[PDB]
Coordinates of C-alpha atoms in Angstrom, one line a residue:
Chain A
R1 CA -89.7 -4.9 -215.2
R2 CA -92.4 -4.4 -217.8
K3 CA -91.0 -7.4 -219.8
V4 CA -91.2 -9.7 -216.8
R5 CA -94.9 -10.1 -217.3
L6 CA -94.4 -10.6 -221.0
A7 CA -94.5 -14.3 -222.1
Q8 CA -91.4 -13.9 -224.2
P9 CA -88.4 -12.5 -222.1
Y10 CA -85.8 -11.3 -224.5
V11 CA -83.5 -8.4 -225.0
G12 CA -82.2 -6.9 -228.2
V13 CA -78.6 -5.9 -228.4
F14 CA -77.3 -3.2 -230.8
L15 CA -74.0 -1.5 -231.6
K16 CA -73.7 2.3 -231.5
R17 CA -72.0 4.3 -234.3
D18 CA -69.1 6.7 -233.9
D19 CA -69.2 9.7 -231.5
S20 CA -71.3 8.1 -228.8
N21 CA -73.7 10.5 -227.1
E22 CA -76.3 9.6 -224.6
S23 CA -78.4 12.7 -225.4
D24 CA -78.2 11.8 -229.1
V25 CA -79.3 8.2 -228.3
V26 CA -82.4 9.4 -226.4
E27 CA -83.0 12.0 -229.1
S28 CA -82.1 10.4 -232.5
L29 CA -82.4 6.6 -233.1
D30 CA -80.0 6.9 -236.1
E31 CA -77.0 6.6 -233.8
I32 CA -77.5 2.9 -233.3
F33 CA -76.3 0.6 -236.1
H34 CA -79.0 -1.3 -238.0
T35 CA -77.2 -4.5 -237.2
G36 CA -78.4 -6.1 -234.0
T37 CA -78.6 -9.4 -232.1
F38 CA -81.6 -10.6 -230.1
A39 CA -81.0 -12.9 -227.2
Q40 CA -82.9 -14.5 -224.3
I41 CA -82.6 -13.1 -220.8
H42 CA -80.9 -15.4 -218.3
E43 CA -81.5 -13.8 -214.9
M44 CA -81.5 -10.5 -213.1
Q45 CA -78.7 -10.2 -210.5
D46 CA -78.4 -6.5 -209.6
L47 CA -75.8 -7.4 -207.0
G48 CA -74.2 -4.0 -206.6
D49 CA -76.1 -1.8 -209.1
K50 CA -79.8 -1.9 -210.1
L51 CA -78.9 -2.9 -213.7
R52 CA -76.5 -5.8 -214.2
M53 CA -78.3 -7.4 -217.2
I54 CA -76.8 -10.4 -219.1
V55 CA -76.6 -10.2 -222.9
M56 CA -75.2 -12.8 -225.3
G57 CA -74.9 -12.9 -229.1
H58 CA -77.6 -15.4 -230.0
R59 CA -79.6 -14.3 -233.1
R60 CA -78.0 -11.7 -235.3
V61 CA -80.0 -9.6 -237.7
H62 CA -79.7 -6.4 -239.8
Chain B
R1 CA -85.4 -23.4 -224.5
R2 CA -88.8 -23.7 -226.4
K3 CA -90.7 -24.5 -223.2
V4 CA -89.3 -21.4 -221.4
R5 CA -91.8 -19.2 -223.2
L6 CA -94.6 -21.6 -222.2
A7 CA -96.6 -20.2 -219.2
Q8 CA -96.5 -23.6 -217.5
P9 CA -92.9 -25.0 -217.3
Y10 CA -93.1 -28.8 -217.0
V11 CA -91.3 -31.9 -218.1
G12 CA -92.4 -35.6 -218.4
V13 CA -90.0 -38.4 -217.7
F14 CA -90.8 -41.9 -218.9
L15 CA -89.1 -45.3 -218.5
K16 CA -87.3 -47.0 -221.5
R17 CA -87.8 -50.7 -222.3
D18 CA -85.0 -53.2 -221.9
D19 CA -82.4 -53.3 -224.7
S20 CA -82.1 -49.5 -224.9
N21 CA -81.4 -48.1 -228.3
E22 CA -80.7 -44.4 -228.9
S23 CA -81.8 -44.6 -232.6
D24 CA -85.1 -46.4 -231.7
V25 CA -85.9 -43.5 -229.3
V26 CA -86.2 -41.1 -232.3
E27 CA -87.4 -43.8 -234.7
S28 CA -90.0 -45.6 -232.6
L29 CA -92.2 -44.2 -229.8
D30 CA -93.4 -47.6 -228.6
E31 CA -90.0 -48.5 -227.0
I32 CA -90.7 -46.1 -224.1
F33 CA -93.0 -47.4 -221.2
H34 CA -96.6 -46.2 -221.1
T35 CA -96.0 -45.2 -217.5
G36 CA -94.5 -41.8 -216.9
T37 CA -94.2 -39.0 -214.4
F38 CA -94.7 -35.3 -215.0
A39 CA -93.2 -32.6 -212.9
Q40 CA -92.0 -28.9 -213.0
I41 CA -88.5 -27.8 -213.8
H42 CA -86.8 -26.1 -210.9
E43 CA -84.0 -24.1 -212.5
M44 CA -81.3 -24.5 -215.2
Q45 CA -77.7 -24.8 -214.1
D46 CA -75.8 -25.8 -217.3
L47 CA -72.6 -25.4 -215.2
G48 CA -70.2 -27.5 -217.4
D49 CA -72.6 -29.3 -219.8
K50 CA -75.1 -27.4 -221.9
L51 CA -77.8 -29.8 -220.7
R52 CA -78.0 -30.4 -216.9
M53 CA -81.7 -30.6 -216.2
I54 CA -83.1 -31.5 -212.8
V55 CA -86.0 -34.0 -212.9
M56 CA -88.4 -34.9 -210.2
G57 CA -91.2 -37.5 -209.9
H58 CA -94.2 -35.5 -208.9
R59 CA -97.4 -36.7 -210.8
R60 CA -97.3 -40.3 -211.9
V61 CA -99.5 -41.4 -214.8
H62 CA -100.1 -44.4 -217.1

């Protein structure tokens, strides 16, 4: 919601490392790989759930 | 995609002169008619083709 007001609507996509742990993700940022991919946000649907975001691999980076 | 970030999304549609030439469109800007019409993009579909824009004639200008 905060990025709706932003002039540039985009989402970064990243890949987690081995031994996925939500607590670790919210605690240590080293779990996520340095490699990532920024992409533009298409549209919010939230048909069944409140988070049904769309992510595509557009601009890779490390 | 570059005008999505723009606060005001709009598009201008002009009229080409007789003897249309695709190369001349990018080579010469005088082929197109002075008269044009500016409007606002409604929404992207891109169902089958990557480019399927919807164009309206809203504000005519010369």
